[PDB]
Amino acid sequence: GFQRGPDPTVSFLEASSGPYSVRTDNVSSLVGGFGGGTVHYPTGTTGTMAAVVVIPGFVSAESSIEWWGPKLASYGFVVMTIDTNSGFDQPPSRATQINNALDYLLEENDSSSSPYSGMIDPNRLGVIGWSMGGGGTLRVAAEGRIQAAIPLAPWDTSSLRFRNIETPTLIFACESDVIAPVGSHADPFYEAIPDSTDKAFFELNNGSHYCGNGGNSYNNELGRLGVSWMKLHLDQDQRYNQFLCGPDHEDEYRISEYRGTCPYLE
Ligand SMILES: [Ca+2]
Ligand SMILES: [Ca+2]
């Protein structure tokens, strides 16, 4: 079970939005302990669905990760994007921020009066995180609480904390990144994760540190692979395996390197 929506296609995944109209709930920084944000939830749906937190992690970023909110929610997820300039900073504080954001969603889910009351299945939680938020994502993945992880241009001080990650993890690396150079961050972080774990490494060709944030030159890749990652691992929706295990990913112009442990869900 957990499957939702029609048989997927590339065009279905690369469209500017998914099928479901999306409504929003603004969360003040006064509540939650995670810096405020916006809950994106689909309309017209039935049943429960997975929840995803999307967290930034670049102090004085020029832009953020908001694209993921409406994009992912429109394929059947409750997706909260966290605001920037929250007082959190380094990867350990960002793990706390993620945990507080997840608590908040579950708390509102358990409320009878939330606009998305009862929409979330608490057993199916994912996190997408950028920069030091990506280091925080990998740290929460290592804590064992989540069911899928997408670090975006992750930054952290060490890879040793990630040597036991069992959470399905897709790292988007940005080839030309000078903030979190791939060779010192996304690459060794990916290689630290055991080869028994369902994982993938997608380096985006010529990408700056912002390349994974979406609403940019990489929409096709981030949507096609990122939505598929969450459908496959949070919904156990085998219909999305085709986009992740099978294609010659590096043949794509936008993808300068691919690594992975296909097949998944063995
Ligand atoms: Ca290049
Ligand atoms: Ca495998």
Side-chain angles (χ1 to χ4, degrees):
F2 307 147
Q3 280 183 21
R4 169 178 283 106
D7 301 339
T9 66
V10 171
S11 64
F12 173 78
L13 281 163
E14 290 180 350
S16 59
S17 76
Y20 311 127
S21 293
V22 172
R23 286 178 171 209
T24 50
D25 192 49
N26 174 75
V27 184
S28 160
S29 51
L30 222 181
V31 296
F34 60 82
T38 305
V39 183
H40 310 252
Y41 62 97
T43 57
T45 67
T46 67
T48 53
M49 61 198 56
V52 174
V53 165
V54 193
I55 177 181
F58 190 49
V59 177
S60 300
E62 302 198 2
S63 53
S64 190
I65 39 67
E66 296 295 348
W67 177 80
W68 288 96
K71 174 72 180 172
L72 186 60
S74 68
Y75 297 78
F77 298 89
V78 177
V79 183
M80 189 169 74
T81 56
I82 297 174
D83 297 345
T84 62
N85 268 61
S86 60
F88 299 84
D89 210 334
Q90 306 291 305
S93 75
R94 300 287 189 180
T96 297
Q97 192 177 12
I98 295 162
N99 280 307
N100 295 336
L102 289 168
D103 291 349
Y104 172 82
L105 285 172
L106 293 176
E107 183 162 352
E108 296 295 313
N109 191 38
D110 200 58
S111 159
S112 68
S113 63
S114 171
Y116 51 95
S117 171
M119 283 184 71
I120 301 179
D121 178 353
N123 301 321
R124 310 192 289 116
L125 301 178
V127 176
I128 302 169
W130 171 46
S131 197
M132 301 179 167
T137 292
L138 285 161
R139 286 169 180 258
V140 175
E143 301 172 332
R145 188 181 175 177
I146 59 173
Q147 288 66 60
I150 305 181
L152 305 169
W155 188 97
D156 213 334
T157 51
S158 179
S159 61
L160 297 202
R161 286 166 197 107
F162 315 140
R163 301 182 285 166
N164 204 36
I165 292 181
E166 313 135 86
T167 301
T169 300
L170 186 174
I171 287 164
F172 281 113
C174 295
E175 192 194 19
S176 305
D177 192 341
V178 303
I179 303 298
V182 173
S184 295
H185 293 273
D187 177 346
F189 299 171
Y190 171 83
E191 291 300 335
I193 300 172
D195 285 349
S196 62
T197 300
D198 293 349
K199 64 177 182 175
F201 179 81
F202 283 101
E203 189 182 71
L204 300 183
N205 190 15
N206 301 326
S208 73
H209 187 56
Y210 291 77
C211 87
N213 296 1
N216 64 8
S217 300
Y218 303 96
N219 291 340
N220 294 341
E221 291 75 27
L222 300 170
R224 189 179 72 251
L225 304 165
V227 174
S228 292
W229 197 257
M230 295 303 193
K231 300 290 268 194
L232 182 66
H233 295 291
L234 293 183
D235 294 354
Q236 297 292 296
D237 187 345
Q238 194 69 7
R239 302 177 293 172
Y240 287 84
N241 185 58
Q242 43 181 323
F243 308 103
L244 298 163
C245 295
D248 187 5
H249 299 291
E250 287 190 357
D251 199 56
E252 293 288 329
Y253 170 70
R254 292 293 183 181
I255 296 173
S256 56
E257 191 180 2
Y258 166 79
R259 309 169 199 169
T261 51
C262 291
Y264 298 145
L265 281 54
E266 279 182 333

